[PDB]
């Protein structure tokens, strides 16, 4: 992994464990798992490996970053978490948001993504424009996930599977509707829907469709559609990597 995780105090570790439980209950009750996953992903996805800037360091709560067009509708997520965060003053926002992402996947029935504490809250949000454009294709996905974040082609396909929960909103991105018939259930249905073609009532972004036509991405879509266990394994790996971009050296 190339990771050396920092030491945190026993009190910090206790807070992580307690916050994890409180997050399960809150996220399940509020039905906001997909929104919390999006919040964690948009926090982390700004990492640029060349300059070591952006990444999961608490900056998404900053008015300046929330205002990024890619982040439309995430102000809600930040507000929803503020009362719970206030119960855990010892935790960084950085850790709290990544923990919420991990919990979002868990409570919707997804894999248990390993979590290591210690991210510091950094003062400077990254510049706008690093998050992917839903209207573009495979070259663009590699620029963003590969050239900037430093994730693999496998990670790209697995992480796209995060769309197995949630929906787009015409008031946020402009796109509208869920990718799956069960948007609060984490499973491999995203890939199965991708393969079956356009079904009325279900969403496919151009960026999703790009996975089907790329020589490297397509076999991965096929694998995940055929084998949910393989999806969960590769997803857990990718999510952990994403949640740790720029953190614990690397
Ligand atoms: C591959 C490039 C990606 C593109 C172009 C993209 C684009 C989008 C767009 C346009 C929306 C709709 C936002 C709205 O209108 O509410 C969305 C929602 C969402 N995204 Fe992605 N995304 C990508 C990757 C990811 C990744 C890597 C994850 C996490 C692993 C993720 C998780 C989600 C979730 C859970 C939602 C639903 C949010 C909700 O229900 O409110 N996406 N994405
Ligand atoms: Na689903």
Automatic annotation (TrEMBL):
State the EC number(s). 1.11.1.11
Positions annotated to bind heme b 2: 41-42, 163, 167, 169, 173
Q: Which residues carry this modification: Pros-methylhistidine?
A: 163
Keyword GTP-binding assigned to the entry: answer is no
- An example Pfam family from this entry, by short name, is peroxidase
The EC class name is oxidoreductase
Molecular-function GO terms, alphabetical: heme binding; L-ascorbate peroxidase activity; metal ion binding
Per the record, the domain of life is Eukaryota
The answer to keyword Metal-binding applying to this record is yes
What residues does heme b 1 bind to? 163, 167, 169, 173
What are the protein's UniProt keywords? Calcium, Heme, Hydrogen peroxide, Iron, Metal-binding, Oxidoreductase, Peroxidase, Potassium
Example of a GO biological process term: cellular response to oxidative stress
**Limits of the Plant heme peroxidase family profile domain:** 74-250
- The protein's required cofactors: heme b
Q: Where is this region: Disordered?
A: 113-137
Q: Where is the composition biased (Basic and acidic residues)?
A: 117-137
Quick one: which residues bind L-ascorbate?
30, 35, 172
Q: Which Gene3D superfamilies match?
A: 1.10.520.10, Peroxidase, domain 2 (1.10.420.10)
User: What family is this?
Assistant: Belongs to the peroxidase family. Ascorbate peroxidase subfamily.
Q: What is this protein called?
A: L-ascorbate peroxidase
């Amino acid at each position: 992994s190339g990771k050396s995780y920092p030491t945190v105090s026993a009190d910090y570790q206790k807070a992580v464990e307690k916050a994890k439980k409180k997050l399960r209950g809150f996220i399940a009750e509020k039905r906001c798992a997909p929104l919390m996953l999006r919040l964690a992903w948009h926090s982390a996805g700004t990492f640029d490996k060349g300059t070591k800037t952006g990444g999961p360091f608490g900056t998404i709560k900053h008015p300046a970053e929330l205002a990024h067009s890619a982040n439309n509708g995430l102000d809600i997520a930040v507000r929803l978490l503020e009362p719970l965060k206030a119960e855990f003053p010892i935790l960084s926002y950085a850790d709290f948001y990544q923990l919420a992402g991990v919990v979002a996947v868990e409570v919707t029935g997804g894999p248990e993504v390993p979590f290591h504490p210690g991210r510091e809250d950094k003062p400077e949000p990254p510049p706008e424009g690093r998050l992917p454009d839903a209207t573009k294709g495979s070259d663009h996905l590699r620029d963003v996930f590969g050239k900037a974040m430093g994730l693999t082609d496998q990670d790209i396909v697995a992480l796209s599977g995060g769309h197995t929960i949630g929906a787009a909103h015409k008031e946020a991105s402009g796109f509208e509707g869920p990718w799956t018939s069960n948007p609060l259930i984490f499973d491999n249905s995203y890939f199965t829907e991708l393969l079956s073609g356009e079904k009325e009532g279900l969403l496919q972004l151009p960026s999703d469709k790009a996975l089907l036509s790329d020589p490297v991405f397509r076999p991965l879509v096929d694998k995940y559609a055929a084998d949910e266990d393989a999806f969960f394994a590769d997803y857990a790996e990718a999510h952990q990597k994403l949640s740790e971009l720029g953190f614990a050296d690397a």
